[PDB]
Amino acid sequence: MSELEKAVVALIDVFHQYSGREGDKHKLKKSELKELINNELSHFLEEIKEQEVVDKVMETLDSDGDGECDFQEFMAFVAMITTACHEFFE
Amino acid sequence: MSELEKAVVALIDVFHQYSGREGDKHKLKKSELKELINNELSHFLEEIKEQEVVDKVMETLDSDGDGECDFQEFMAFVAMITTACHEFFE
Ligand SMILES: CC[n+]1c(-c2ccccc2)c2cc(N)ccc2c2ccc(N)cc21
Ligand SMILES: CC[n+]1c(-c2ccccc2)c2cc(N)ccc2c2ccc(N)cc21
Ligand SMILES: [Ca+2]
Ligand SMILES: [Ca+2]
Ligand SMILES: [Ca+2]
Ligand SMILES: [Ca+2]
């Protein structure tokens, strides 16, 4: 597969590596989202060390209000992070 | 870097491999978008062989109406493709 398809595959895989840890295996709860950011986005986002930051990130990306981040909400988060990186440089 | 960061990097790179071919080097015109889909998404999207399909895809993703796909519009397209794949399986 192409580099773009490898990226799509990796996005799906990372989501599940974190969503499938606890509770609803199809969504990210706060602790899963914190670990995803801290382990997988260390070059793009500041490490999260405070509950208030976890809470604010989840609040910002939880579009449907159910308290967790589903796959569509995760992809919107990825788009936001990627666009912010691009805008930093361009 | 992590697998997620490699994916972010690949998304930026593929965009530029296609946007930087012709005209505005920061946006995808129709021909650049067609080649991106045909060369890089052959496992996820049907090959485009008709002008009418090119036109419809651009119309659908060109949120700001300027006739080209910028980086933010491309990331929305990636999110849409990735979410559609996920929903096919889940
Ligand atoms: C069955 C869907 N699906 C896919 C999946 C497979 C193929 C394409 C898209 C997603 C998946 C893909 C990866 N990498 C990691 C975990 C899961 C997963 C985990 C749980 C579940 N209940 C469904 C899951
Ligand atoms: C200067 C921005 N920037 C980046 C870039 C570099 C680092 C981070 C994000 C984007 C870039 C990254 C890749 N892979 C391929 C092409 C370009 C590119 C091409 C043209 C341009 N005028 C700016 C460009
Ligand atoms: Ca979970
Ligand atoms: Ca939600
Ligand atoms: Ca161009
Ligand atoms: Ca546009």
Swiss-Prot record, chains A, B:
Ca(2+) 1 binds at S19, E22, D24. GO terms for cellular component: ciliary basal body; cytoplasm; cytosol; extracellular region; extracellular space; neuronal cell body; nucleoplasm; nucleus. The keyword Transmembrane does not apply. Its main location: cytoplasm. It holds the Pfam family EF-hand_1. Keywords: Acetylation, Calcium, Cell adhesion, Cytoplasm, Metal-binding, Nucleus, Repeat, Secreted, Zinc. Residues 13-48, 49-84 form the EF-hand domain. It comes from the Eukaryota. CDD domains: S-100B. GO terms for biological process: adaptive thermogenesis; astrocyte activation; axonogenesis; cell adhesion; learning or memory; memory; negative regulation of monocyte chemotactic protein-1 production; phosphorylation. GO terms for molecular function: calcium ion binding; calcium-dependent protein binding; kinase inhibitor activity; protein homodimerization activity; RAGE receptor binding; S100 protein binding; tau protein binding; zinc ion binding. InterPro entries: EF-hand-dom_pair (IPR011992), EF_Hand_1_Ca_BS (IPR018247), EF_hand_dom (IPR002048), S100-B (IPR028481), S100/CaBP7/8-like_CS (IPR001751), S100_Ca-bd_sub (IPR013787). Dimer of either two alpha chains, or two beta chains, or one alpha and one beta chain. The S100B dimer binds two molecules of STK38. Interacts with CACYBP in a calcium-dependent manner. Interacts with ATAD3A; this interaction probably occurs in the cytosol prior to ATAD3A mitochondrial targeting. Interacts with S100A6. The S100B dimer interacts with two molecules of CAPZA1. Interacts with AGER. Interacts with PPP5C (via TPR repeats); the interaction is calcium-dependent and modulates PPP5C activity. Interacts with TPPP; this interaction inhibits TPPP dimerization. Small zinc- and- and calcium-binding protein that is highly expressed in astrocytes and constitutes one of the most abundant soluble proteins in brain. Weakly binds calcium but binds zinc very tightly-distinct binding sites with different affinities exist for both ions on each monomer. Physiological concentrations of potassium ion antagonize the binding of both divalent cations, especially affecting high-affinity calcium-binding sites. Acts as a neurotrophic factor that promotes astrocytosis and axonal proliferation. PANTHER family: PROTEIN S100-A1-RELATED, S100 CALCIUM-BINDING PROTEIN. This is Protein S100-B. It comes from Bos taurus. The gene is S100B.
